[PDB]
Amino acid sequence: TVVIVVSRDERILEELLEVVLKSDPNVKTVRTDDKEKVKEEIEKARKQGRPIVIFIRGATEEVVRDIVEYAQKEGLRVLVIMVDQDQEELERIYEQLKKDGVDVRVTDNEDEAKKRLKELLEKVLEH
Amino acid sequence: TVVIVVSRDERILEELLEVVLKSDPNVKTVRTDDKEKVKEEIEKARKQGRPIVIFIRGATEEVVRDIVEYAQKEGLRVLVIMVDQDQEELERIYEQLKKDGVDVRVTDNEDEAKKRLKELLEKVLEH
């Protein structure tokens, strides 16, 4: 009933939106990162009795959580397709680095990266 | 000797570059996604006998592989810091979706996403 396509890549969201619009012009589509706009459209999708595909970047874990909960409490089925193009290319880089003897550290934010880099230079700039 | 900071996020690369420039102005830095420019700078880093931090977006697995091999065959130590801010936020979304009963599919490219979405609509648009 409610399909959510999640991707940080705007170009990918555009292309998938196109695929939906050109394949079956009868399913509703909405491109927005605004939770309210989403709810407003899900409802119109209800009145018109049509399925809806939502295109979002995420990635707020709260925004996706709300949308999923909102639709479920109305008995709407929720299907999700996540597209993480980045993830997979980074994964291969990581493997090769490890493949060699490279001491690789994967950080999840600049704050963490900052700490590790400083700690790295504070101990490499030393001879 | 050679530090490579990999991140798809330009703003993160900028901030880390800043951290290096403001903390120890004696270590060489280079921001480029061009393999040749990198080699040209690694060498200058050699002549001047200084360590170097390279800031790249990647994520070509070939580009990172070459740089790592180039420096190693010169007996340079290679340390890497990868910063994947995206990955971690997507990871949490995925968990919540799974937390609920959401049938979630993670695709690694639009080609794959296209197939799965079409297959999804070809079977949902059906009553």
Side-chain angles (χ1 to χ4, degrees), chain A residues 1-60 62-127, chain B residues 1-60 62-127:
Chain A
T1 309
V2 179
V3 178
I4 308 175
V5 176
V6 185
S7 173
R8 295 271 161 109
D9 189 298
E10 190 70 52
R11 177 79 98 105
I12 290 179
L13 294 179
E14 173 175 333
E15 301 173 300
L16 280 38
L17 175 52
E18 200 179 309
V19 171
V20 184
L21 271 48
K22 289 178 168 185
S23 298
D24 190 303
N26 294 71
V27 48
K28 185 186 178 72
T29 67
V30 56
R31 166 68 187 95
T32 178
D33 298 307
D34 182 62
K35 174 171 57 183
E36 300 308 308
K37 181 69 176 183
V38 167
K39 282 175 291 185
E40 303 184 309
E41 303 295 315
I42 298 172
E43 239 38 67
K44 286 192 287 186
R46 292 301 291 162
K47 292 192 177 184
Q48 299 166 15
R50 314 161 59 188
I52 186 181
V53 182
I54 308 164
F55 293 92
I56 60 186
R57 284 175 84 258
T60 56
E62 180 237 290
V63 169
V64 169
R65 191 191 142 264
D66 304 315
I67 297 173
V68 163
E69 296 182 303
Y70 178 87
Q72 293 193 304
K73 69 179 303 181
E74 281 167 41
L76 300 173
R77 184 186 179 194
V78 179
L79 297 170
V80 176
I81 291 183
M82 293 184 68
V83 190
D84 44 66
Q85 190 155 290
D86 271 5
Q87 190 273 173
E88 132 86 348
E89 318 181 310
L90 298 170
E91 171 54 40
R92 310 211 313 293
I93 291 175
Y94 174 80
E95 179 47 83
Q96 216 152 51
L97 291 178
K98 285 304 191 62
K99 180 179 298 175
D100 288 296
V102 183
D103 179 349
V104 187
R105 275 121 315 188
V106 279
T107 65
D108 316 296
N109 56 74
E110 91 88 45
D111 310 288
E112 192 187 328
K114 181 182 177 182
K115 291 186 173 63
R116 305 303 166 209
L117 181 52
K118 294 165 71 73
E119 187 199 314
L120 199 62
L121 296 189
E122 188 227 290
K123 277 76 172 192
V124 66
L125 294 162
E126 195 176 66
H127 183 56
Chain B
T1 309
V2 179
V3 178
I4 308 175
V5 176
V6 185
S7 173
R8 295 271 161 109
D9 189 298
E10 190 70 52
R11 177 79 98 105
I12 290 179
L13 294 179
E14 173 175 333
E15 301 173 300
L16 280 38
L17 175 52
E18 200 179 309
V19 171
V20 184
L21 271 48
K22 289 178 168 185
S23 298
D24 190 303
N26 294 71
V27 48
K28 185 186 178 72
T29 67
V30 56
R31 166 68 187 95
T32 178
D33 298 307
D34 182 62
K35 174 171 57 183
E36 300 308 308
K37 181 69 176 183
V38 167
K39 282 175 291 185
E40 303 184 309
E41 303 295 315
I42 298 172
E43 239 38 67
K44 286 192 287 186
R46 292 301 291 162
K47 292 192 177 184
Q48 299 166 15
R50 314 161 59 188
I52 186 181
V53 182
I54 308 164
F55 293 92
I56 60 186
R57 284 175 84 258
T60 56
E62 180 237 290
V63 169
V64 169
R65 191 191 142 264
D66 304 315
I67 297 173
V68 163
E69 296 182 303
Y70 178 87
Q72 293 193 304
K73 69 179 303 181
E74 281 167 41
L76 300 173
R77 184 186 179 194
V78 179
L79 297 170
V80 176
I81 291 183
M82 293 184 68
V83 190
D84 44 66
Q85 190 155 290
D86 271 5
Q87 190 273 173
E88 132 86 348
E89 318 181 310
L90 298 170
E91 171 54 40
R92 310 211 313 293
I93 291 175
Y94 174 80
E95 179 47 83
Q96 216 152 51
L97 291 178
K98 285 304 191 62
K99 180 179 298 175
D100 288 296
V102 183
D103 179 349
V104 187
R105 275 121 315 188
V106 279
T107 65
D108 316 296
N109 56 74
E110 91 88 45
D111 310 288
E112 192 187 328
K114 181 182 177 182
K115 291 186 173 63
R116 305 303 166 209
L117 181 52
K118 294 165 71 73
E119 187 199 314
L120 199 62
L121 296 189
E122 188 227 290
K123 277 76 172 192
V124 66
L125 294 162
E126 195 176 66
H127 183 56

mmCIF file of all heavy atoms in Angstrom, chain A residues 121 125, chain B residues 19-28:
data_model
loop_
_atom_site.group_PDB
_atom_site.id
_atom_site.type_symbol
_atom_site.label_atom_id
_atom_site.label_comp_id
_atom_site.label_asym_id
_atom_site.label_seq_id
_atom_site.Cartn_x
_atom_site.Cartn_y
_atom_site.Cartn_z
ATOM 1 N N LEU A 121 48.136 11.799 14.065
ATOM 2 C CA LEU A 121 49.212 12.725 13.755
ATOM 3 C C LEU A 121 50.041 13.001 14.996
ATOM 4 O O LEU A 121 51.242 13.233 14.902
ATOM 5 C CB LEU A 121 48.655 14.034 13.195
ATOM 6 C CG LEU A 121 47.924 13.933 11.850
ATOM 7 C CD1 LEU A 121 47.630 15.339 11.336
ATOM 8 C CD2 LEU A 121 48.771 13.166 10.837
ATOM 9 N N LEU A 125 53.822 12.179 13.864
ATOM 10 C CA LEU A 125 54.740 13.315 13.846
ATOM 11 C C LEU A 125 55.589 13.057 15.075
ATOM 12 O O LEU A 125 55.415 13.704 16.105
ATOM 13 C CB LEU A 125 53.975 14.628 14.024
ATOM 14 C CG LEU A 125 53.006 15.047 12.918
ATOM 15 C CD1 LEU A 125 52.039 16.106 13.442
ATOM 16 C CD2 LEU A 125 53.794 15.564 11.730
ATOM 17 N N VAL B 19 41.703 20.800 10.597
ATOM 18 C CA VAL B 19 42.304 20.239 11.802
ATOM 19 C C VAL B 19 43.796 19.984 11.611
ATOM 20 O O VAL B 19 44.586 20.232 12.520
ATOM 21 C CB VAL B 19 41.657 18.899 12.200
ATOM 22 C CG1 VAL B 19 42.457 18.257 13.328
ATOM 23 C CG2 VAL B 19 40.207 19.122 12.628
ATOM 24 N N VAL B 20 44.187 19.482 10.441
ATOM 25 C CA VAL B 20 45.610 19.215 10.190
ATOM 26 C C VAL B 20 46.392 20.520 10.017
ATOM 27 O O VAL B 20 47.457 20.695 10.596
ATOM 28 C CB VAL B 20 45.828 18.350 8.919
ATOM 29 C CG1 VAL B 20 47.306 18.025 8.774
ATOM 30 C CG2 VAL B 20 45.016 17.059 8.999
ATOM 31 N N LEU B 21 45.854 21.435 9.218
ATOM 32 C CA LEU B 21 46.508 22.714 8.970
ATOM 33 C C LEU B 21 46.675 23.580 10.220
ATOM 34 O O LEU B 21 47.696 24.258 10.380
ATOM 35 C CB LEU B 21 45.741 23.499 7.899
ATOM 36 C CG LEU B 21 46.109 23.276 6.422
ATOM 37 C CD1 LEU B 21 46.185 21.810 6.089
ATOM 38 C CD2 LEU B 21 45.072 23.966 5.552
ATOM 39 N N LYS B 22 45.684 23.553 11.108
ATOM 40 C CA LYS B 22 45.737 24.354 12.331
ATOM 41 C C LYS B 22 46.504 23.713 13.486
ATOM 42 O O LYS B 22 46.967 24.416 14.392
ATOM 43 C CB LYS B 22 44.314 24.695 12.805
ATOM 44 C CG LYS B 22 43.584 25.703 11.922
ATOM 45 C CD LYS B 22 42.169 25.970 12.401
ATOM 46 C CE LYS B 22 41.582 27.174 11.686
ATOM 47 N NZ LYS B 22 40.229 27.550 12.196
ATOM 48 N N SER B 23 46.639 22.389 13.453
ATOM 49 C CA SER B 23 47.331 21.664 14.518
ATOM 50 C C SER B 23 48.838 21.535 14.302
ATOM 51 O O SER B 23 49.630 21.834 15.190
ATOM 52 C CB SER B 23 46.710 20.273 14.690
ATOM 53 O OG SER B 23 45.345 20.364 15.065
ATOM 54 N N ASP B 24 49.238 21.077 13.128
ATOM 55 C CA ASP B 24 50.653 20.931 12.837
ATOM 56 C C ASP B 24 50.910 21.308 11.386
ATOM 57 O O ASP B 24 50.899 20.452 10.496
ATOM 58 C CB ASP B 24 51.110 19.498 13.094
ATOM 59 C CG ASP B 24 52.616 19.354 13.027
ATOM 60 O OD1 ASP B 24 53.197 19.696 11.975
ATOM 61 O OD2 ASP B 24 53.219 18.905 14.025
ATOM 62 N N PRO B 25 51.149 22.606 11.135
ATOM 63 C CA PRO B 25 51.416 23.171 9.810
ATOM 64 C C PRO B 25 52.656 22.620 9.111
ATOM 65 O O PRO B 25 53.012 23.078 8.025
ATOM 66 C CB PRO B 25 51.533 24.669 10.094
ATOM 67 C CG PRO B 25 50.637 24.857 11.280
ATOM 68 C CD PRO B 25 51.014 23.678 12.136
ATOM 69 N N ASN B 26 53.319 21.642 9.718
ATOM 70 C CA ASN B 26 54.514 21.079 9.090
ATOM 71 C C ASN B 26 54.294 19.762 8.330
ATOM 72 O O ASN B 26 55.192 19.271 7.642
ATOM 73 C CB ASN B 26 55.625 20.933 10.131
ATOM 74 C CG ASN B 26 56.104 22.279 10.646
ATOM 75 O OD1 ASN B 26 55.393 22.965 11.384
ATOM 76 N ND2 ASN B 26 57.307 22.674 10.240
ATOM 77 N N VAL B 27 53.106 19.182 8.459
ATOM 78 C CA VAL B 27 52.804 17.959 7.729
ATOM 79 C C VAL B 27 52.120 18.419 6.442
ATOM 80 O O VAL B 27 51.272 19.316 6.462
ATOM 81 C CB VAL B 27 51.870 17.023 8.528
ATOM 82 C CG1 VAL B 27 50.695 17.799 9.084
ATOM 83 C CG2 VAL B 27 51.384 15.895 7.630
ATOM 84 N N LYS B 28 52.521 17.830 5.323
ATOM 85 C CA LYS B 28 51.970 18.198 4.028
ATOM 86 C C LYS B 28 50.531 17.705 3.883
ATOM 87 O O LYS B 28 50.136 16.679 4.452
ATOM 88 C CB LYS B 28 52.850 17.629 2.912
ATOM 89 C CG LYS B 28 52.453 18.049 1.506
ATOM 90 C CD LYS B 28 53.295 17.315 0.460
ATOM 91 C CE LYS B 28 52.890 17.674 -0.972
ATOM 92 N NZ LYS B 28 53.295 19.049 -1.358
#
